[PDB]
C-alpha cells in the first residue's frame, strides 16, 4: 500500500464568462481511500487559496462563482491527493478564464414559413439564460445547419449576431431538419440545439 | 449621407469592428508564433505578471465593469491603446528588418500595427465627444535577433499580452456600446 | 466667354472603406480650355487640401489612397472649374466613407454540380473588406443565371451559398453574383463563371 499516484487536472470551462469550473482525474489511490482538495494562486497575489465550492459542479470538480472568478487573470491550479500512507500533488495547471469560454446550446428554436413578394423559411432562436448578451458583456455568434430527413450532408449558414436567419435555397416539398449552435465573439462552439423539423409547401 | 454629424452610435459601431478584428489578428498571430517557435517548451512560467499594463486599475469581472464610470472607462481604454503603440511598432520592425527570413507572422503584425492607430484615432474622437473633466504606463523593451530561449521568451510575452489587452479593449468597447447607446438592451 | 462652371458632383464610392473615389461631370466649359481641380477638407480643421490622385481611377475623378481615407471625419468635396478670366465652385458634397460603400463583386465563385435529381450547388466568398472578413456583417447577396437575353434572378439573404434546382440537362449555364451592405450600394455583377450541365 502506497501514497496516491499523481492526480491529473485536464479540463476547465466557463459557460457564461463570469464563473468557471475545473475537473480532475484522481491518481492511483495506492489501495486506500483518498481525500482530494484543490488549491490555486492568482496572478499578482502571492497567496494560495483553497477551492470555494467542491459541491456545485459535483464529484471531482471545483466551481468558481462570480465572486471568485476574475477574467484576464492566469490561475495556477494544482490538485492534491492525501490518503493514510501519504499525499501527492499534481502538476500545476496555468488556467486563463478568458480563453476557456464554452456556452450551452441555444434554446427556443422556432421555425416559420413566411413570404414577402418569394417564399422562405426563417429560423428564430434565443441564447442561454446564463450568458449576458443584453449588457454587452457577452457578445455571441451563431450558426445553423439544415438537411432533408434522409441525407448525409448538412448545409451551414453563419448568422453573425442575429438570433434569426431567413433561408431561401430550400426545395419545396421535402421536410428539413434544423439545428443551431453558438460561440462567443472569441471562444468555442457549443453542443448543437435540440433539432426542429418542418415540411415545405409546394 | 443624411445628418456635419459623426454620431456617437456610429463611433462605437466602428470602434467595435476594429477592436474585434484587432483581437482576432493578435490571437492568430500568437498562435502562429506558438506553433512555429514555442508550442510547449515550458513558457508562460515566465509570463505571469509580465504584462506592462497590469499596473492599471483594470476591471476584472462583470460586476467591476458594471460599477465603473463611462468616462473614466473610456480614458482607461485610450491609456491601454497608446500603451501598445510602441511595442507593435517594434514587433513589426524587429520581425522585418532583423529577422532572418521571417514568416507570414509579419503580414498580420503590420495589419495590427496599422489598425491599432486607426482605432486609437477613432477612440480619441469619442473621448472628445463625451468631455472628461480629468486628464499611462510605458514599456515595450524588445530584443533583436530564432534561437536562444531568453530572446524569444520576451517575444512570447509581448504576443501573450497583446492577446490579453486586445481582448479587454474589445470587451470593454462592447460593454460600453451597449450601456450608453442601447441602454443595456442589445 | 466666362466659365459658368456648373460642375455636377457625380458620386463617391468606396470598395472597402480603406479607399474611396469621387467622380465629377464637366461644368460647361464656356468656350475656353477649362481645368478641373477637386479640393476637399475635413470639417474640424480649417485646412483645405487638393486631391492626391487625379490619375488612377477614371478621367474626371479623384482617388483617395489608404493614406487619405479615414472613417472618422466627414469630407467636404468641392470641384473647381477654371479657365482664363473666371473660376467656379460646385455644391459641396458631404460624404462619410462608410455610408458610400460599393463593394467589389463576390470573390471565388464555385459552381459545383452536386450528385435523384442533379442540382447545381452555387457557392461563393464575400469581397475583401474589414467587416465581413470575420465580422459585423450585413451582407446580402443575389445571383442570376441564364442558358445561352433573359436572366433568372435569385435573392439569397446573407447566404454565401445557394442551391438551384431543375435545370435543362446538356446545356451550358452562365452565373453571376452581387452583394450589398447596410446603407451601402449594390456591387457590380461578377465575372461570368460558366458550368456545363451533365449530358
From Swiss-Prot, chain A:
Q: Domain Fibronectin type-III: where?
A: 3-103, 105-202
Which residues point to the Extracellular side?
1-202
Q: List the disulfide bonds.
A: 12-22, 51-62
Q: Where in the cell is it found?
A: Membrane
Q: Where does Zn(2+) bind?
A: 185-186
Which residues does the annotation flag as glycosylated?
35, 80, 108
Task: Give start-end ranges for motif WSXWS motif.
Answer: 189-193
What does this protein do, in the record's words? Answer: This is a receptor for the anterior pituitary hormone prolactin.
Q: Subunit structure, per the record?
A: Interacts with SMARCA1. Interacts with NEK3 and VAV2 and this interaction is prolactin-dependent.
- Which family is this sequence assigned to? Belongs to the type I cytokine receptor family. Type 1 subfamily.
Entry comment, domain topic = The WSXWS motif appears to be necessary for proper protein folding and thereby efficient intracellular transport and cell-surface receptor binding.
- Under which name does UniProt file this protein? Prolactin receptor
UniProtKB/Swiss-Prot annotation, chain B:
Keywords, alphabetical: Disulfide bond, Glycoprotein, Hormone, Lactation, Phosphoprotein, Secreted, Signal
Concerning InterPro entries, the annotation shows: 4_helix_cytokine-like_core, Somatotropin/Prolactin, Somatotropin_CS
Task: Provide the Gene Ontology terms for cellular component.
Answer: endosome lumen; extracellular region; extracellular space
Biological process annotations from GO: cell surface receptor signaling pathway; female pregnancy; lactation; mammary gland development; negative regulation of angiogenesis; negative regulation of endothelial cell proliferation; positive regulation of canonical NF-kappaB signal transduction; positive regulation of lactation
* One GO MF term: prolactin receptor binding
Q: Which compartments does it reside in?
A: Secreted
- One protein family per Pfam: Hormone_1
Outcome of substituting residue 122 to D/F/L/N/R/V/Y:
Inhibits signaling via PRLR; mutant PRL acts as a PRLR antagonist
What's the chief localization of this chain? secreted
Disulphides: 3-4, 51-161, 178-186
* UniProt cross-references to Gene3D superfamilies, sorted A to Z: 1.20.1250.10
Q: At which residues is Phosphoserine found?
A: 19, 27, 83, 128, 153
Q: Using the UniProt annotation, give the residues that carry a glycan (glycosylation sites).
A: 24
**Family recorded in the similarity comment:** Belongs to the somatotropin/prolactin family.
The subunit field of the Swiss-Prot or TrEMBL record says: Interacts with PRLR.
Sum up the protein's function in the record's words.
Prolactin acts primarily on the mammary gland by promoting lactation.
Protein name listed in UniProt: Prolactin
Q: Which organism is it from?
A: Homo sapiens (Human)
Gene that specifies this protein: PRL
Amino acid at each position: 500500500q502506497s501514497p496516491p499516484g499523481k492526480p491529473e487536472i485536464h479540463k476547465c470551462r466557463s459557460p457564461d464568462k463570469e464563473t468557471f469550473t475545473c475537473w480532475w482525474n484522481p491518481g492511483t489511490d495506492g489501495g486506500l481511500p483518498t481525500n482530494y482538495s484543490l488549491t490555486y494562486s492568482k496572478e499578482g497575489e502571492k497567496t494560495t487559496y483553497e477551492c470555494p465550492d467542491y459541491k456545485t459542479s459535483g464529484p471531482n470538480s471545483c466551481f468558481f462563482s462570480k465572486q471568485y472568478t476574475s477574467i484576464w487573470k492566469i490561475y495556477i491550479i494544482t490538485v492534491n491527493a492525501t490518503n493514510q500512507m501519504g499525499s501527492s500533488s499534481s502538476d500545476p495547471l496555468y488556467v486563463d478564464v478568458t480563453y476557456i469560454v464554452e456556452p450551452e446550446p441555444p434554446r427556443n428554436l422556432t421555425l416559420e414559413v413566411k413570404q414577402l413578394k418569394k417564399t422562405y423559411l426563417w429560423v428564430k432562436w434565443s441564447p442561454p439564460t446564463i450568458t449576458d448578451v443584453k449588457t454587452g458583456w457577452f457578445t455571441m455568434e451563431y450558426e445553423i445547419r439544415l438537411k432533408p430527413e434522409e441525407a448525409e450532408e448538412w448545409e451551414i449558414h453563419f448568422t453573425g449576431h442575429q438570433t434569426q436567419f431567413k433561408v431561401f435555397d430550400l426545395y419545396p416539398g421535402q421536410k428539413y431538419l434544423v439545428q443551431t449552435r453558438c460561440k462567443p465573439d472569441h471562444g468555442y462552439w457549443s453542443r448543437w440545439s435540440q433539432e426542429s423539423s418542418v415540411e415545405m409547401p409546394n | 449621407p443624411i445628418c456635419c454629424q459623426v454620431t456617437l452610435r456610429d463611433l462605437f459601431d466602428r470602434a467595435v469592428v476594429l477592436s474585434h478584428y484587432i483581437h482576432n489578428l493578435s490571437s492568430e498571430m500568437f498562435s502562429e508564433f506558438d506553433k512555429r517557435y514555442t508550442h510547449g517548451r515550458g513558457f508562460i512560467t515566465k509570463a505571469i505578471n509580465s504584462c506592462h499594463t497590469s499596473s492599471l486599475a483594470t476591471p476584472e469581472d462583470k460586476e467591476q465593469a458594471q460599477q465603473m464610470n463611462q468616462k473614466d472607462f473610456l480614458s482607461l481604454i485610450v491609456s491601454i491603446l497608446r500603451s501598445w503603440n510602441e511595442p507593435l511598432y517594434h514587433l513589426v520592425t524587429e520581425v522585418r528588418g532583423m529577422q532572418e527570413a521571417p514568416e507570414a507572422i509579419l503580414s498580420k503584425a503590420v495589419e495590427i500595427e496599422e489598425q491599432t492607430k486607426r482605432l486609437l484615432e477613432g477612440m480619441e474622437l469619442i473621448v472628445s465627444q463625451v468631455h472628461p473633466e480629468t486628464k499611462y504606463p510605458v514599456w515595450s523593451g524588445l530584443p533583436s535577433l530564432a534561437d536562444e530561449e531568453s530572446r524569444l521568451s520576451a517575444y512570447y510575452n509581448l504576443l501573450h499580452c497583446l492577446r490579453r489587452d486586445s481582448h479587454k479593449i474589445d470587451n470593454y468597447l462592447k460593454l460600453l456600446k451597449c450601456r450608453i447607446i442601447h441602454n443595456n438592451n442589445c
